């Protein structure tokens, strides 16, 4: 049994071992189209808090071929990792990042208190807590328009009954596990009419 050489590895090392991740509301989506997918380099990273695969077998990833692989990356709290799952309700699953009920992919979330936490407070990661409707699956919403909660119209300047819909995780190394930084990568596998170009060695 002989096969052609293994040449074009997919860039999972860039998705996982990134210097900085994106905020939850403006999550980072990376497309993967033409490369042999080595899912064995994922396990080379830190022990994961959550490795949950829906739709496909975790140990049969190299035996499948998909047309596209989407990698969504963000940083959430420790108590919001349960919301990254099909059919969940909460602050993240309704206003920031929604997965479809019939979801095919894998969610990988791991602790990053060493990286994304500062002793004085890491006021960089943001999340949206005010919205007027639940998000559709795989729909982003990047906006800084002042939310309106009262009957009085809100022109666009903050004030009474006028609040910005985004706040920040003030990540600190003295917080509990439920509020530590947690890097989350969601791999979604597409099976469109195009030929399956993401394969496995």
């Amino acid at each position: 049994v002989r096969f052609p050489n293994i040449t074009n590895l997919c860039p999972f090392h860039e998705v996982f071992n990134a210097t900085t991740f994106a905020s939850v509301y403006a999550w980072n989506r990376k497309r993967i189209s033409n490369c042999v997918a080595d899912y064995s380099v994922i396990y080379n990273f830190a022990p994961f808090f959550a490795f949950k695969c829906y739709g496909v077998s975790p140990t049969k990833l190299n035996d499948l071929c998909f047309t596209n692989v989407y990698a969504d990356s963000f940083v959430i709290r420790g108590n919001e990792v349960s919301q990254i799952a099909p059919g969940q309700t909460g602050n993240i699953a309704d206003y920031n990042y929604k997965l479809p009920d019939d979801f095919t992919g894998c969610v990988i979330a791991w602790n990053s208190n060493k990286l994304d936490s500062k002793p004085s407070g890491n006021y960089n990661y943001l999340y949206r807590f005010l919205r007027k409707s639940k998000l559709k699956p795989f729909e982003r919403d990047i906006s800084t328009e002042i939310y309106q909660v009262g009957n009085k119209p809100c022109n666009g300047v903050a004030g009474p009954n006028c609040y910005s819909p985004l706040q920040s995780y003030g990540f600190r190394p003295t917080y509990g596990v439920g509020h530590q930084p947690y890097r989350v990568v969601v791999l979604s596998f597409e099976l469109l009419h195009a030929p399956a170009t993401v394969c496995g060695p």
Partner: antibody
Amino acid sequence: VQLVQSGGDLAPPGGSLRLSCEASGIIVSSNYMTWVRQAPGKGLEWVSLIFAGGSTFYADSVKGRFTVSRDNSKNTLYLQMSSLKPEDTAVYFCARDLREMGGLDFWGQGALVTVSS
Amino acid sequence: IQMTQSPSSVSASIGDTVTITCRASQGIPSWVAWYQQKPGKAPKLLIYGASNLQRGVPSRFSGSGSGTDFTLTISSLQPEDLAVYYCHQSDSLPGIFGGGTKVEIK
């Protein structure tokens, strides 16, 4: 600005009740709403929380029996108690939630529910 | 998660400074709110974010804290402060209300 509360009466150990809160000065559709009960002589206990989108969350004791609803035409927030118990006798408060930027800033007057005879 | 509070055995004279302390089981962000409930009345918000004074609330109420330790302070205990004071983690999907502290006049 104002949350006027209505409802609350004696119910049997299996009766169903509905408590209402009419909001003036705020839009119930655009705010988090919370129901918090206080037992007679006890502390404050969180019961229910409805979101602006429509997602509902309940406590472990009241899950499967209580339903928080919202009527948009009358700008009213409802708590429906399908199955009751002697432990549900309390004073219920409907509050506008401003989580992480104020919390429960506006409260209703409270409706008293007694479950006996 | 858990939010323990100092007991209700607080009795101070008029004008005395009163401190009420809240201790979380694990470290939480400074998103703790304080509530003042008079007998037969709904609770009234006092301080949100553990350091921000609510509009219409007298300046005698000062909040300060971080990590696991939070504190409410009444600089002068005027007679209008005979009420139960509750702590509340404002970012808890299941609401977490600590046992209130009953302030009494001696």
